[PDB]
Amino acid sequence: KESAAAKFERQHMDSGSSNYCNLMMCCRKMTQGKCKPVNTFVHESLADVKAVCSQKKVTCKNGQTNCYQSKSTMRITDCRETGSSKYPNCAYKTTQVEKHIIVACGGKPSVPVHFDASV
Ligand SMILES: O=c1ccn([C@@H]2O[C@H](CO)[C@@H](OP(=O)(O)O)[C@H]2O)c(=O)[nH]1
Numbered sequence: 001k002e003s004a005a006a007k008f009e010r011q012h013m014d015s016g017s018s019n020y021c022n023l024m025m026c027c028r029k030m031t032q033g034k035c036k037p038v039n040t041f042v043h044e045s046l047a048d049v050k051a052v053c054s055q056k057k058v059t060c061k062n063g064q065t066n067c068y069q070s071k072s073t074m075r076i077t078d079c080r081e082t083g084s085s086k087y088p089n090c091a092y093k094t095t096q097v098e099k100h101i102i103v104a105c106g107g108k109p110s111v112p113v114h115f116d117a118s119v
């Protein structure tokens with residue numbers, strides 16, 4: 001069983017083309033069983049992302065208060081399923097932007113365990 005922190009790294013970290021999401025959603029296993037409809041990859045170092053856990057506290061979309069917002073914008077890519085997408089033939093629109101990220105943090109040490117939003 002993969003931990004929440006490991007799942008966060010696999011689905012969201014790509015510390016670092018229109019086919020980017022199509023390749024990544026597949027390699028990171030977000031197209032098995034169903035096409036994950038929306039996902040965000042963060043291109044900052046794992047250290048910079050883990051640091052968000054000690055940055056600005058904000059409320060989580062689900063109501064929890066263990067969420068934090070990055071102090072700076074970060075380079076991210078949003079992958080969104082296209083209308084033509086249909087499992088097992090998933091298809092994604094890739095959009096790069098620079099925005100702040102909001103993540104839920106948990107564990108000891110407190111590390112990201114869920115990508116909540118970009119803002
Ligand atoms: O900007 C956003 C907002 C939400 N999500 C994702 O959308 C899914 C539904 O909220 C969540 O993934 P999960 O199914 O693993 O919990 C969350 O990570 C993103 O990737 N980016």
Ligand SMILES: Nc1ncnc2c1ncn2[C@H]1O[C@H](CO)[C@@H](O)[C@H]1O
Nearest residue numbers: 003004005007060062064104113114
């Ligand atoms: N605010 C949140 N805090 C922690 N985990 C969350 C939150 N929203 C969704 N999740 C989920 O993401 C985790 C993925 O490992 C699940 O364990 C479940 O907690």
